[PDB]
C-alpha cells in the first residue's frame, strides 16, 4: 500500500496466529523467555533476531517503529522516550567529542539549548546558520562536521528549508542531512526522505500521538546514506566495534547500520526507551493521523483568513501565506496542506498578547503542539525562555509573538473564541 491513510492502520502488524488479536497488544513485559541457553547466547551475540529485553525492543514498540518508518518512507525506525532523546541519541551516534554539526538557528527552544549548552560539555559543538542560504551552510562545514540538522518547519516561525539544495551540499561533503519533521505530522505534510534527508526525527508527543496523552520520540533511518563510502567521517560505522568483539556494522547490516547502532549501542547504554503503554497510546493516534492532519490544516487556513482581516491582529505568520519569507519552499514541499500552526501579533502594548490568550475559553494555554485541542503559548517566555534575546530573534521569536496550534474543533468555535476574547481586550 502506498497511501498514507492505509499504511497508518495496517503497516507493521499482522495478528499473531496464537491469539489472532486484531488490535496491537500491550506487551507489558521487561523480558522474553529464551527457548534454551543456546538461543539466549545467539540473541546476545547478535547472531539471531529476537526479543531479549524491553530496554532494547518490545513488540508493541516494534509496531509503532515499523508504522512510522513506513509512513515516512524509511527502512526502519527506533523509538525513544521523548523527542529530545531522539535528537540526542541521533547526534550521539553520528558525533563524538571533538566533532561538530551544522544546524539551522531556527529551532524549538529545547533543541537549541541541547545543541548550544548540553552537547558542548560532551565535546560536541554546533555551528548555527541563520540565513537559510546554501552558501552559508556550505561555508560552515569543516572536516569535523558530522551532520546538517534542520527542522522541516521551524518552531515557531515556520521556516521551510531548501531540502534538496541543502541535501546536495551535505552529500557532496559526505555528511548526512538530519531533519526534525515534528511539524510535518509524521510525514503527512512533508516527507523529507523524498527530498534528500538521510535521517528523520520526531517528537511523537505532538501530531503523531495527537491527543496530548503521551511523551515519545522516534528516529527514522532512510537507509540511503552509504556510510562505507564516507567512512573517513564515520569510522565507527565500518571499523571493528569495541562493544561487540570487533563486529563490523556496515559489513553485517548495510543500509540498516545507523538504526542498528541506535538500538544495540545507544538504547542499550543510554537507555532512553519507550514504554509499550506509551506506544499503544501513540498507535491509537497514528490510526487517524491523516484525517486529523487534514482537518488541522483546513482549520489553520480558515483561521488565518479570519486573522488576516481582523483589525485586532497586527500580523499573521503562516507558511501558506504568499508573504511568508520561505513561501517559495513551502509551495514546493507542502502539497497536502500548509501545516497545523500559525503565529500572530495583536495590536496594543506588551500587555495585549497575554490579555488575548488569558481571555480565551476554548483554546488552552499550555506547552504542547499538535493536540486535537487548540492551544496557544507565548514562546518568548516559555518554549524559548532559555535563549538570549538575540538567540530568540535568530529563531524568529519576538516578544509580541503568540504561537497557535490549531485544533480540530469546529473552526467557527475557534474563531468565535478569539472574537469574544478580542472584544473583552479591545471593545
For ligand WBJ, the binding residues (CB under 6 A) are 53, 55, 82-84, 108, 110-111, 151, 155, 180, 182-183, 203, 205, 215, 217, 271, 367-369, 383
Q: What are the cell numbers at 193? A: 526522505
Closest residue to ligand WBJ using C-beta atoms: 83
How near is the Cβ of 368 to a copy of itself at its closest, in Å? 4
Taking the C-alpha atoms of residue 71 and residue 80, their distance in angstroms, rounded to an integer, is: 18
How near is the Cβ of 238 to ligand WBJ at its closest, in Å? 28
Residue 240, interface with a copy of itself (CB under 8 A)? no
- Let me know: does 99 contact 126? Beta carbons within 8 Å: no
Residue 252, interface with a copy of itself (CB under 8 A)? no
* Helix, strand, or coil (residue 57): coil
Residue 364, interface with a copy of itself (CB under 8 A)? yes
Taking the C-alpha atoms of residue 277 and residue 58, their distance in angstroms, rounded to an integer, is: 11
How near is the Cβ of 155 to ligand WBJ at its closest, in Å? 4
The number of helices, as runs of H, and strands, as runs of E, in the chain is 16, 12
From the list 138, 141, 134, 182, the residue with the least C-alpha distance to 161 is 134
Q: Which does 180 bind (CB under 5 to 8 A by kind): a copy of itself, ligand WBJ, none?
A: ligand WBJ
Among 44, 134, 139, 419, binds a copy of itself (CB under 8 A): 44
Residue 426, interface with a copy of itself (CB under 8 A)? no
Beta carbon nearer to ligand WBJ, 365 or 368: 368
- Cβ burial, residue 227 (10 Å; 0-12/13-18/19+): buried
Beta carbon nearer to ligand WBJ, 134 or 367: 367
How near is the Cβ of 135 to ligand WBJ at its closest, in Å? 26
Subset of 264-323 contacting a copy of itself (CB under 8 A): 265, 268-275, 277-278, 281
How near is the Cβ of 97 to a copy of itself at its closest, in Å? 4
Q: Which does 326 bind (CB under 5 to 8 A by kind): a copy of itself, ligand WBJ, none?
A: none
190-198, 238-246, 297-305, 391-399 -> range binding a copy of itself (CB under 8 A): 238-246
Taking the C-alpha atoms of residue 93 and residue 195, their distance in angstroms, rounded to an integer, is: 23
The strand pair at 100-104 and 145-151 is best described as: parallel
116-124, 131-139, 340-348, 407-415 -> range binding a copy of itself (CB under 8 A): 116-124
Residue 400, interface with a copy of itself (CB under 8 A)? no
CB neighbours of 263 closer than 8 A, spacing ≥ 6?
56, 57, 78
Taking the C-alpha atoms of residue 105 and residue 113, their distance in angstroms, rounded to an integer, is: 11
How near is the Cβ of 118 to ligand WBJ at its closest, in Å? 13
Q: Which does 182 bind (CB under 5 to 8 A by kind): a copy of itself, ligand WBJ, none?
A: ligand WBJ
Q: Which does 353 bind (CB under 5 to 8 A by kind): ligand WBJ, a copy of itself, none?
A: a copy of itself
Residue 261, interface with a copy of itself (CB under 8 A)? no
- The DSSP result for 167-198, as a single string, is HHHHHHTT--EEEE-GGGTTTTS--GGGGT-S
Q: Chain-centre distance of CA 106, in angstroms?
A: 14
Q: How many CB atoms lie within 10 A of CB 173?
A: 17
How near is the Cβ of 356 to a copy of itself at its closest, in Å? 9
Beta carbon nearer to ligand WBJ, 124 or 218: 218
Question: Can you tell me which residue has the cell 530573534?
Answer: 393
Beta carbon nearer to ligand WBJ, 95 or 115: 115
Beta carbon nearer to ligand WBJ, 159 or 425: 159
- Cβ burial, residue 327 (10 Å; 0-12/13-18/19+): middle
Residue 23, interface with a copy of itself (CB under 8 A)? no
Phi, psi for 355 (deg, rounded to 5)? -65, -40
Q: How many CB atoms lie within 10 A of CB 23?
A: 11
Instruction: Specify the DSSP element, H or E, that contains 285.
Output: helix 276-286
Beta carbon nearer to a copy of itself, 93 or 222: 93
How near is the Cβ of 294 to a copy of itself at its closest, in Å? 22
Taking the C-alpha atoms of residue 282 and residue 215, their distance in angstroms, rounded to an integer, is: 9
Residue 398, interface with a copy of itself (CB under 8 A)? no
Residue 131, interface with a copy of itself (CB under 8 A)? no
Amino acid at each position: 500500500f502506498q497511501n498514507f491513510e492505509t499504511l497508518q492502520l495496517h503497516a507493521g502488524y499482522t495478528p499473531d496466529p496464537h491469539t489472532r488479536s486484531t488490535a496491537v497488544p500491550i506487551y507489558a513485559t521487561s523480558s522474553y523467555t529464551f527457548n534454551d541457553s543456546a538461543h539466549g547466547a545467539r540473541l546476545f551475540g547478535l547472531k539471531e533476531l529476537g526479543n531479549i529485553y524491553s530496554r532494547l525492543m518490545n513488540p508493541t514498540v516494534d509496531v509503532f517503529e515499523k508504522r512510522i518508518a513506513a509512513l515516512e518512507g524509511g527502512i526502519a525506525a527506533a523509538a525513544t522516550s521523548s523527542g529530545q532523546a531522539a535528537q540526542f541519541l541521533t547526534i550521539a551516534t553520528l558525533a563524538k567529542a571533538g566533532d561538530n554539526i551544522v544546524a539551522s538557528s531556527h529551532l524549538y527552544g529545547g533543541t537549541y539549548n541541547q545543541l548550544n549548552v548540553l552537547l558542548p560539555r560532551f565535546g560536541i559543538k554546533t555551528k548555527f546558520v541563520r540565513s537559510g542560504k546554501l552558501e552559508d551552510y556550505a561555508a560552515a562545514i569543516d572536516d569535523q562536521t558530522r551532520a546538517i540538522y534542520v527542522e522541516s518547519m521551524s518552531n515557531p516561525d515556520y521556516v521551510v528549508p531548501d531540502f534538496e539544495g541543502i541535501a546536495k551540499i551535505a552529500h557532496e561533503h559526505g555528511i548526512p542531512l538530519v531533519v526534525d519533521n515534528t511539524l510535518g505530522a509524521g510525514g503527512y505534510y512533508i516527507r523529507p526522505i523524498e527530498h534528500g534527508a538521510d535521517i528523520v526525527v520526531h517528537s511523537a508527543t505532538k501530531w503523531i500521538g495527537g491527543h496530548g496523552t503521551t511523551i515519545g520520540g522516534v528516529i527514522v533511518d532512510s537507509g540511503r546514506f552509504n556510510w562505507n563510502k564516507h567512512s573517513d567521517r564515520f569510522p565507527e560505522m565500518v571499523e571493528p566495534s569495541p562493544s561487540y568483539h570487533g563486529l563490523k556494522y556496515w559489513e553485517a547490516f548495510g543500509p540498516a547500520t545507523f538504526i542498528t547502532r541506535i538500538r544495540v549501542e545507544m538504547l542499550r547504554d543510554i537507555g532512553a526507551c519507550l514504554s509499550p503503554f506509551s506506544a499503544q497510546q501513540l498507535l491509537l493516534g497514528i490510526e487517524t493521523l491523516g484525517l486529523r492532519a487534514e482537518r488541522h490544516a483546513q482549520n489553520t487556513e480558515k483561521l488565518s483568513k479570519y486573522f488576516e482581516s481582523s483589525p485586532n491582529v497586527s500580523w499573521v505568520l503562516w507558511p501558506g501565506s504568499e508573504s511568508h519569507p520561505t513561501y517559495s519552499q513551502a509551495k514546493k514541499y507542502l502539497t497536502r496542506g500548509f501545516g497545523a500552526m500559525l503565529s500572530i501579533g495583536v495590536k496594543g502594548d506588551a500587555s495585549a498578547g497575554s490579555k488575548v490568550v488569558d481571555g480565551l475559553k476554548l483554546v488552552s494555554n499550555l506547552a504542547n503542539v499538535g493536540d486535537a485541542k487548540s492551544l496557544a503559548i507565548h514562546p518568548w517566555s516559555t518554549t524559548h525562555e532559555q535563549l538570549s534575546e538575540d538567540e530568540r530573534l535568530a529563531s524568529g521569536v519576538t516578544e509580541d509573538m503568540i504561537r497557535i496550534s490549531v485544533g480540530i474543533e469546529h473552526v467557527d468555535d475557534i474563531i468565535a473564541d478569539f472574537e469574544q476574547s478580542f472584544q473583552k481586550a479591545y471593545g
